[PDB]
Write an enzyme that holds these catalytic residues in place. Sequence first.
Site, PDB file in Angstrom:
ATOM      1  N   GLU A 266      -1.814  -5.038   4.801  1.00  0.00           N
ATOM      2  CA  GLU A 266      -0.946  -6.191   5.049  1.00  0.00           C
ATOM      3  C   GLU A 266      -1.362  -7.035   6.250  1.00  0.00           C
ATOM      4  OE1 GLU A 266       3.055  -4.686   5.512  1.00  0.00           O
ATOM      5  OE2 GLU A 266       2.764  -3.153   3.985  1.00  0.00           O
TER       6      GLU A 266
ATOM      7  N   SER B 224      12.003  -1.659   7.936  1.00  0.00           N
ATOM      8  CA  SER B 224      11.131  -2.039   6.834  1.00  0.00           C
ATOM      9  C   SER B 224      11.713  -1.884   5.444  1.00  0.00           C
ATOM     10  CB  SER B 224       9.824  -1.235   6.884  1.00  0.00           C
ATOM     11  OG  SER B 224       9.011  -1.505   5.751  1.00  0.00           O
ATOM     12  N   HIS B 225      11.211  -2.715   4.537  1.00  0.00           N
ATOM     13  CA  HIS B 225      11.590  -2.678   3.135  1.00  0.00           C
ATOM     14  C   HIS B 225      10.577  -1.736   2.492  1.00  0.00           C
ATOM     15  CE1 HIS B 225       8.308  -5.910   2.171  1.00  0.00           C
ATOM     16  NE2 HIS B 225       7.909  -5.012   3.050  1.00  0.00           N
ATOM     17  N   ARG B 226      10.661  -1.601   1.171  1.00  0.00           N
ATOM     18  CA  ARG B 226       9.729  -0.781   0.404  1.00  0.00           C
ATOM     19  C   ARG B 226       9.082  -1.711  -0.626  1.00  0.00           C
ATOM     20  NH1 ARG B 226      10.005   4.648   1.087  1.00  0.00           N
ATOM     21  NH2 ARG B 226       7.882   4.449   0.241  1.00  0.00           N
ATOM     22  N   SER B 227       7.948  -1.294  -1.184  1.00  0.00           N
ATOM     23  CA  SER B 227       7.242  -2.096  -2.185  1.00  0.00           C
ATOM     24  C   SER B 227       8.159  -2.463  -3.348  1.00  0.00           C
ATOM     25  CB  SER B 227       6.022  -1.334  -2.712  1.00  0.00           C
ATOM     26  OG  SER B 227       5.052  -1.201  -1.699  1.00  0.00           O
TER      27      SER B 227
ATOM     28  N   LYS C 259      12.193   3.237   7.623  1.00  0.00           N
ATOM     29  CA  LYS C 259      12.461   3.146   6.189  1.00  0.00           C
ATOM     30  C   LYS C 259      13.609   4.091   5.856  1.00  0.00           C
ATOM     31  CE  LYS C 259       7.776   1.907   4.695  1.00  0.00           C
ATOM     32  NZ  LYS C 259       6.512   2.342   4.040  1.00  0.00           N
TER      33      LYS C 259
ATOM     34  N   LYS D  60      10.364  -6.290   8.781  1.00  0.00           N
ATOM     35  CA  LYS D  60       9.408  -6.803   7.837  1.00  0.00           C
ATOM     36  C   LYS D  60      10.033  -6.481   6.496  1.00  0.00           C
ATOM     37  CE  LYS D  60       6.293  -2.915   6.905  1.00  0.00           C
ATOM     38  NZ  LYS D  60       4.862  -2.525   6.818  1.00  0.00           N
TER      39      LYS D  60
ATOM     40  N   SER E 203       8.268  10.594  -5.035  1.00  0.00           N
ATOM     41  CA  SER E 203       8.751  11.805  -5.694  1.00  0.00           C
ATOM     42  C   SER E 203       8.120  13.053  -5.084  1.00  0.00           C
ATOM     43  CB  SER E 203       8.447  11.748  -7.192  1.00  0.00           C
ATOM     44  OG  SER E 203       7.093  11.399  -7.412  1.00  0.00           O
TER      45      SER E 203
ATOM     46  N   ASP F 124      -0.857  -4.186   8.909  1.00  0.00           N
ATOM     47  CA  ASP F 124      -0.543  -2.851   8.423  1.00  0.00           C
ATOM     48  C   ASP F 124      -1.830  -2.457   7.709  1.00  0.00           C
ATOM     49  OD1 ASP F 124       0.248  -0.460   7.419  1.00  0.00           O
ATOM     50  OD2 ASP F 124       2.036  -1.190   6.378  1.00  0.00           O
TER      51      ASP F 124
ATOM     52  N   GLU G 250      -0.134  -1.473  12.333  1.00  0.00           N
ATOM     53  CA  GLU G 250       0.546  -0.327  11.739  1.00  0.00           C
ATOM     54  C   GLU G 250      -0.467   0.578  11.045  1.00  0.00           C
ATOM     55  OE1 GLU G 250       3.905  -1.505   9.287  1.00  0.00           O
ATOM     56  OE2 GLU G 250       3.523   0.169   7.912  1.00  0.00           O
TER      57      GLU G 250
ATOM     58  N   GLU H   5       4.988  -7.925  -2.837  1.00  0.00           N
ATOM     59  CA  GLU H   5       5.835  -8.377  -1.739  1.00  0.00           C
ATOM     60  C   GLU H   5       5.823  -9.883  -1.549  1.00  0.00           C
ATOM     61  OE1 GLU H   5       4.844  -6.100   1.756  1.00  0.00           O
ATOM     62  OE2 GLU H   5       5.503  -4.232   0.778  1.00  0.00           O
TER      63      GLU H   5
ATOM     64  N   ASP I 156       3.789   4.615  10.387  1.00  0.00           N
ATOM     65  CA  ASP I 156       4.426   4.464   9.079  1.00  0.00           C
ATOM     66  C   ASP I 156       4.187   5.812   8.393  1.00  0.00           C
ATOM     67  OD1 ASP I 156       5.503   3.678   6.652  1.00  0.00           O
ATOM     68  OD2 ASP I 156       4.017   2.286   6.168  1.00  0.00           O
TER      69      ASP I 156
ATOM     70  N   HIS J 273      -2.625  -2.529  -2.547  1.00  0.00           N
ATOM     71  CA  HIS J 273      -1.664  -3.532  -3.015  1.00  0.00           C
ATOM     72  C   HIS J 273      -2.336  -4.747  -3.663  1.00  0.00           C
ATOM     73  CE1 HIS J 273       2.027  -2.305  -0.328  1.00  0.00           C
ATOM     74  NE2 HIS J 273       1.471  -1.272  -0.933  1.00  0.00           N
TER      75      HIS J 273
HETATM   76 CL   LIG Z   1       6.073   0.961   0.771  1.00  0.00          CL
HETATM   77 MG   LIG Z   2       2.775   0.689   5.973  1.00  0.00          MG
END
Ligand SMILES: [Cl-]
Ligand SMILES: [Mg+2]
Lengths: 434, 433
Positions: free
Chosen positions: B166, B369-372, B342, B393, B39, B244, B292, B209, B317, B157
């Site tokens: 990661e 890449s995906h997101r959380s 992303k 990923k 946001s 990462d 990363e 994830e 990233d 995470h």
């Molecule tokens: Cl993320």
């Molecule tokens: Mg990252």
Amino acid sequence: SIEKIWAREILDSRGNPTVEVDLYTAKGLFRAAVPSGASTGIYEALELRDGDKQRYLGKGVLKAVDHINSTIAPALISSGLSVVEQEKLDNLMLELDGTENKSKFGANAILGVSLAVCKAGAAERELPLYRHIAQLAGNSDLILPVPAFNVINGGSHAGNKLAMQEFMILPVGAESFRDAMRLGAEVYHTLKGVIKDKYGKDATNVGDEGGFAPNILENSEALELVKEAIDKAGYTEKIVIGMDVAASEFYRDGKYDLDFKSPTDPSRYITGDQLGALYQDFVRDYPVVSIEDPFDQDDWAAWSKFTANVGIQIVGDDLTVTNPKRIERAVEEKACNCLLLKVNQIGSVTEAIQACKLAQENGWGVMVSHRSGETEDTFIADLVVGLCTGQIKTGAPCRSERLAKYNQLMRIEEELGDEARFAGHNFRNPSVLH
Amino acid sequence: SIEKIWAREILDSRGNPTVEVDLYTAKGLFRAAVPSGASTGIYEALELRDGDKQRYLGKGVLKAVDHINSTIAPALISSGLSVVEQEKLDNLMLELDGTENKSKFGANAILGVSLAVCKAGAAERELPLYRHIAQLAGNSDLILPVPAFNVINGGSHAGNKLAMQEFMILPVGAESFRDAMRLGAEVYHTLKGVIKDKYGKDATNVGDEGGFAPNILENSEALELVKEAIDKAGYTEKIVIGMDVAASEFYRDGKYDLDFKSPTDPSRYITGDQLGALYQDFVRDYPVVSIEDPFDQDDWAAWSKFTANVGIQIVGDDLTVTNPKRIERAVEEKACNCLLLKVNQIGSVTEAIQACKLAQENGWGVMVSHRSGETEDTFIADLVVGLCTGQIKTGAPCRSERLAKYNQLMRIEEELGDEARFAGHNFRNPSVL
Ligand SMILES: [Cl-]
Ligand SMILES: [Mg+2]
Ligand SMILES: [Mg+2]
Ligand SMILES: [Mg+2]
């Protein structure tokens, strides 16, 4: 009207292979995938695994896929039957398999096709899947089910001592399904903080069904945590509690082990009567309105005794394995008063619908259910609505093999508008809301 | 043209609301959902959240949805534009928004429609999604990417002391994408057992994830666990490791703290050089071929210096945040050699493709890449194939918001038949295959 069928192997939510089927008609492509349980009852229809240790640790499903593409496919195509004929097409595969427990092709092979067939049939009649299912079942006034979110995972679904399998919250007091999703999610998020503050962050990881897997042993503590979250979220009296003990998982020679995930020690084992006395305390000290598999799948005497001494919902899962033969016995012996409907415990849509109607016709409630091992498939969302059962459990509002069904239910509610009603406090028997 | 656009609020893989859009054309219904984003920010596009602390802890997206239904929808319909006109339709939404970071309507609102438009466009062209994307990007030689599975988690995470975020496994030695999934899945299950036996069953649960977060502090211990699992599974010669670090999380007063999850103590802080020296050891001692965010998103000096002194892949990233301007600077300063892509970070299909091509034209690798917070949406699967990036990923092989992508990639490989090609050892530069 089946033009072609092609099955493949995909991975379920735990990373294990499972069956997916693509079925083609003049209307297009219709695909479905099959779930897989972890705490599976010994009476469940056979889930055919390849057993090749050098591949997926023997969990491949190439055999089931080959049976579909090389044997089932040509047969259904030859029949020339329209995909709207769910019963005829299913019975056809049943005969093709020729075994009682679908041990030739596998229940996973048969169900994969059965599911794709149902989706193609709905399209053939130009109707949403839930409406088509309703017609197959003989229902008209559909209704949105109360969701039962498994927010604390235990048993064979998580890495903790907690012996009982699931602690669920049911937004019986929600205004609609969309609203039920909000209360469920809000309590889930509140519960994360409640657990974190008391047990730390390392206790907020989740089990196979998206519920938190805190490092606890006492099942009463799980109930306490859930109740605290509900109150803290401000939804007391609007959210009640459901449980899936899955006692067959810790049944040890007549006795029960509430710490079976720890080094074996018979001294801690408790009798059925003791286990039942514990449930009584839970129903007394907590807002527990439903308990599933309180005893072993063969411990009938215990089921009848407990059920006769409680006014809450008692759900058969491994006891009934969505099997009419087992259901008949449970109804005669009043072992339980609700059937957990698992399409892959029996193997076909037709039989699952029949099992559902059998329970309903006997005054039993019916809760549609996912398996601990799920996929991106959302068939059960439309199924629970079409069968107007009024209740479904398909995970915590965490992990998308779970949300996919909840999201689909919200879309169904949106499409039905003022034509459907939320089950609310009538989740056990919504037929009265019509 | 577009017949109707209806957006709704669905829940993501973490139970938080997000945007979903239904796009209607003569061809039928086309829907897509948006992953979790941010946001606030200054570079990346921002997702619009309701902010009602009483509803969904203030994470609702009713406002974003409203913008789509009461604004974007009618505007795109009136234009009479075909859904095959991705660039024109995306540009129209960008202008309707007006801001530079899509902060008015929300990146989640714009992307939601953008994704649906693309899916509908592919149908109009009577082509699968990955093919339509390939034509939009100007590619023809599609290629299946090497999957990067995040099996061990740390940093923000996880609730452990492990600083790095990661630890991924990449089946570069696999025979095909389908084979890569089997290798990853087998190593994942093997890893679970290794952790259970060494840390206890209580450490076998999963994070957002799908990876494990055992209670460990040493980053080398995480690498050691992954290495053991790879060896125990019998794929030591076919699987490498990707990391990462997400160093921005532990960047402290110009230094780095590899134990920031413990009571503050600047006496343990390390410099960029010291941190880079550690990575140097990881690369020499373990099969690490990609790192990363090794440094803070603003610590350009450290990035450029590290990249110039190693031969492994270096992925931006937070450094690049899928932003053309940021990418341009990184290229000129040789800060990294791979772009993490992303889509929701930029906000539109058209812009994501442009960022990808910008990277590729400059000799950079690109990892989709995906997101959380993911959804059951599988768009990025077709995207990585159409863009021919050679690497993606999108989670551990656990939790279906991850598997949905992986399974879709298997279906794509199957659909390509004999033309199907797996990036394998050339995941960094599949341009050669
Ligand atoms: Cl993320
Ligand atoms: Mg990252
Ligand atoms: Mg079970
Ligand atoms: Mg059960």
